[PDB]
Amino acid sequence: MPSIAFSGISTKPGELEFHVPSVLSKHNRAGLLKSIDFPYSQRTIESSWNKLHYMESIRITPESRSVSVLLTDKESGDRVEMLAMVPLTTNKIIEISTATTDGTIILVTEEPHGFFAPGCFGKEVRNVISSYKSIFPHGTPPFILIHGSNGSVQVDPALFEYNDEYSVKIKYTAIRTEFKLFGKGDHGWMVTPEFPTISMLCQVITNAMNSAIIFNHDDPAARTRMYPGTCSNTHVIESVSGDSLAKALLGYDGVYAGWEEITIPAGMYCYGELDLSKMIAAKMNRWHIDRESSIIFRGVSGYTWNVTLPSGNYGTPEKLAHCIQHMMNMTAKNRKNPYCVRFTLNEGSSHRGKFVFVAAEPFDLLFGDDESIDPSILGFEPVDHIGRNSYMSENDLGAPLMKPNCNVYDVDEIPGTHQIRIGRRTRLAVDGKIRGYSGGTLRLNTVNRTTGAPKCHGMNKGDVVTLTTVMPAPDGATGTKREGFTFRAKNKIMGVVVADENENPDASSLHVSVPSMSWTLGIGSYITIDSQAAPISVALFDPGKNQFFRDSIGASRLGFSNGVSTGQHGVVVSQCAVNLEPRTVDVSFIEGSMTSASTEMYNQNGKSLITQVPSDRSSGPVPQGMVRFNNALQQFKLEFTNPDGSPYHFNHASLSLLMEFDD
Amino acid sequence: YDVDEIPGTHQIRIGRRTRLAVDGKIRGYSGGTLRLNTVNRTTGAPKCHGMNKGDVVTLTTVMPAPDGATGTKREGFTFRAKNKIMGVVVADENENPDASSLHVSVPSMSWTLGIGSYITIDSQAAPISVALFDPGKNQFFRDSIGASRLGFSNGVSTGQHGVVVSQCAVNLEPRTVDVSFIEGSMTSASTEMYNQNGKSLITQVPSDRSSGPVPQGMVRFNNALQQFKLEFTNPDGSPYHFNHASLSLLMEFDD
Amino acid sequence: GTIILVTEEPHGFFAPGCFGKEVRNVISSYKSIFPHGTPPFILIHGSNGSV
Amino acid sequence: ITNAMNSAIIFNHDDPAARTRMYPGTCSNTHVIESVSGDSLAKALLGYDGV
Amino acid sequence: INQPFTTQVQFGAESHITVNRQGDLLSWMYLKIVLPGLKVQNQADTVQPTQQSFASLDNDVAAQADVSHVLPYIEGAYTEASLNTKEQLIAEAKNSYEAAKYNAAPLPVAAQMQSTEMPDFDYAYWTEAIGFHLIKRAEFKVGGATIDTIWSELLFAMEELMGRAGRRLTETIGRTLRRPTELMKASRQEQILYVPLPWYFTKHPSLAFPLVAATYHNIQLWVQWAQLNSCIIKSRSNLVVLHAERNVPISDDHLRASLECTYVHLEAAERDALTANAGTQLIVQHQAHLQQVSSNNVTARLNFNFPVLEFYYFLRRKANKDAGDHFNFSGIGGRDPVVSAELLFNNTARVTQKPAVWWRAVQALQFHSSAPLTNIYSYSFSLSPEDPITPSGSANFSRLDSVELALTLQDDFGAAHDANSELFVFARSYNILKFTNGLAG
């Protein structure tokens, strides 16, 4: 019995090919595997499985609200188009007509209101918003009017009557206690809640379809499916169309397109060198700066400037780039060499891009200085970038796909259960200094309640905010006492965050459409601004369980079940302990390399194994594996599989095996 | 260079330190050559500059002292140019090479007015390339520590910013030792154990004493044996180093 | 209005034309070989600094 | 060096092998490489089997 | 009868089917493949832009590789030239290169400037002959033993040589004869392909596989699928490729396939006779030698076994493979990659050095139903290698100590950008399949 050492270098995950010397290529030999020198080179997180997918609440916008279904009648062959329109999260009122002889008011909206589904298949016109009372959690108001002189007003959806696609009737008596003046020229906002889950959105679309068509979301599969409901006997579904919502729900074999993606760096997270929980939190909070941080740069004159970035949520890389650009140009005072800072998307990508710093003259970015901001936020290495007029980040960063995160997350492992928890931080209200009020819009500079420094607010167009008189400073506040603007309303003052086309988007400048009050008397004074915190849903799948989430870290590794996990309070907890430990590796022959190998070892799936490599070098030697070869062997291929069935990653490590052959 | 193991990935990093500029006291200027004594920017003591003939340096007016500087305030020579002042480090055949004496060919300016004053001198920092090979992979790098031990691939790894990082974690742990017969000591030995290369093994010694006893190995000898030779190989195929240690083995023979 | 710059050592900027090829400026190729922003050539001793 | 050779001769460095190799480029049809000489650079690049 | 796979069908995976016993013999076998229609969207407009990379026409790696070979022959300031001036300089350098290497007379520059009229809109398409390219390997198994193996490259070579006039597989495999505009048109909608699997039993009715005689063996087809990244070409590098109906990024689970088998039902007397005595069938098996090419001189050591009827060989440039042109067996600038070849048995010339045209055109003219449109070379030991039932010559490679195919390739083949070009050699060999007591081997 000659023993032969075989050495191989893996060119592919999970597969090694070995050449048998011609001296041994005789027919009908048993090979005993004596030992494997296994490299244990597979990372806890590999570049092939480093994604986590999550979402907050689903906002309905003018571009993402409609699903159309073409139905064909089975008897006549006639074609009927069926449109579901979902109500907008925020819709502006453009006119309020005064009282017909019956005391009804007509409210005219900027966009089609979507409150009434057209009567179809002999059904009456259905109020879609009336169904929100049964779909949303208890205490969620189905509908709010903003701009009442008395504050925000919850209105029963059943009090609305259809007038046309852009206008609704309501009895003045239903709203009389609250309607005392819409200001001349700003008629306020219609507000509906954002959807906590795809399942709740599918129930509203089903109701807007008068249950002629049923939309169901399967959380275990992370898939939306459409079925014929009450029209199933009379009509066939021919096709589906619609806006960005229809494409998002159905365009990817029912997988929702609005999942935010984080990429975790490949590495060892089981040995305590890298903290996976902190890394997930850092990647979810990519556009949140916890503390005031400095960018250090030097111009051609040899003068070094320090630029202090405001703390808070920038929301998008473009808002961050623009803030850096603005602050660099203000600090350098030099109109002759304007610094330009931009985020640039990669060709063919909608959401991956790089930071680019440009000036007319050469300048240096001092990112190797310990007082500088962590350059990894900007995708740069922590080294000084010198002697160029242009710098582009080495690393690709992800911009938000739909809506930037309104939450900031902590990710921690629960002591004693070892369960991962993804929890939103307590959202702190911001103080806003009143800069001006014109045309129903209040202009505010947002500041940190503790320090009084500028604070990036993370709010976006169509966000609904609550306005209060300046709240007492938090315990341990170091900032100066702020003079509060005092206002009183019967109900909560709400406002809608609006874009202003005329002002540079400083991430600390906040513009809000607000009820007509004496806001001009408050110029220079402060108010407190709060916004609602969103739920979180996390989509996690083990390898091969879902075709869209194939590059996911794995549900089982993070202690999750395969599917969508939702936290209504912005907190999701794993069902099981986190398991990042190296796992056993099943070693088998690749089918078709041999017409017949007998083994005594089988895995749980009945697959023939040569051996099982232990999780680590300390667990003992690799078990001996007897293999019988029925034919003359010139070459054989070995397959190395993880217990999840994924291919083992050799990371360019070599492997050596010792086989003893019978005579 | 700083060399460190990256926390949580266990990857070795060979990184250049931030090259600190040196202050140079102007001693003299003659024939386009500026003569400088180099000093530490923090302490003001003499500092060896590491620069050599043909090095290209940038000259600036004395920069502000670093934070936490303990040295006395230095009087800076002020000069202005539209572009960066560069100079070439030159040898001076007439001066003893004190590693703190720096001679630079510089543009013709009023440098003689700066005698006794200070300027700041900076030089570009180089990239690094590291050549690492496992035993037997390259005939020239045969005495290399091994690419795989340091988490490197076999070959040249280049860091354009003077920083190179290993692809994998460092693995310095003792590895298993393959035990086999030397070919030609025996006309035929049958074994049930083979390594990954198809080489017949007697046994595989574990990485350490704590991993368990050495597996039993059955060997059949077809001939009368007066002597045998054993080969002990690491998993990389390199010979095991006994370091003058003795080894004992127990064999049971059939009757 | 041309200036001649005379060097201490052979400048090596021009490869001789061979095999029917024209004389090639070797330094002109540094713009495509070196990383972006590396100057292929600098003159030192300008009264205005490096060029 | 390949550009200074007008691509008549191609110099390639193989980083995995840490070896420099020389090949006939545009002269491959008309000429044969007889020998290589030069200063310390030629010896440094080619004298040790391309190491 | 159409039958689903026993395992999931996906790009880059292996799938198998256990063939049902719905008749007494198995005759024809087709892989029915369903490919979705393709659409494209800009990466900037996509909510999830992360997809596998595809070959793109704005990054023509094959054209860049061809330009790299003529760079030493470009006279003047190429780097600083306008685009139209660079195209002129490349066409002039091509004349100088071809004059120096081949003593070719110069072509007028205007005749070398073939604008392929590419459409001024965004598209993606399935690669040429996608029905063959999808089948990286298929194995016909009986009782767990592999009876025969076929490869994508072999299927294409077999259709080139044995494909009869008026019965070419064009539509059935998604082949347009390299007309990109037709591939684009076809790729906008769902495609149903019927790829014939040319097993020994599909070649003649008397060779139909006797299911009744093999009752105790499972019959299986195993298929290794091509990776999705290799199956698609796009107009531009920054495009995301979408499933045209579902409006989602194209993914590995969008491959659908089934097996269409023709069963034969026999009269009871013939069925009983065949069950009692199916005896032996003469079979043709396929063997493969696959080699990387890094030099203009290549020796392939053909370790094939059994009585070999014939062999095929051809080369693929790395640049053609990387461009997604998987069945482009041409050399540099579309030339013949082989200058000459020699066949040696035990270091003795069995066929002395012959030029490429002899191996490609003369061998095809003598022994095959068709001449190949691509650079496929053949050699037959058989007078009629396409006759599945009548042996007409062979060489027994199991009795030769060495069989060497020595190739002289074109200049610079396997150099620089074409390092790791591929040599394919396929052989057809006789064996015997025996049926006894409900078993086959």
Author numbering:
A (entry chain S): 1 to 663
B (entry chain S): 409 to 663
C (entry chain S): 103 to 153
D (entry chain S): 205 to 255
E (entry chain A): 51 to 491
Sentences copied from the publication:
The population density of E. huxleyi is restricted by Nucleocytoviricota viruses, including E. huxleyi virus 201 (EhV-201).
(F) AlphaFold2-predicted structure of EhV-201 major capsid protein with double jelly roll fold. Therefore, we speculate that the amphipathic helices attach the outer virion membrane to the capsid. The abundant capsid-outer membrane contacts may enable EhV-201 virions to withstand deformation without negatively affecting the infectivity of the virus. The reconstruction, because of its limited resolution, did not enable identification of minor capsid proteins mediating contacts between the inner membrane and the capsid, as is the case in other NCVs such as Tokyovirus, PBCV-1, and African swine fever virus.
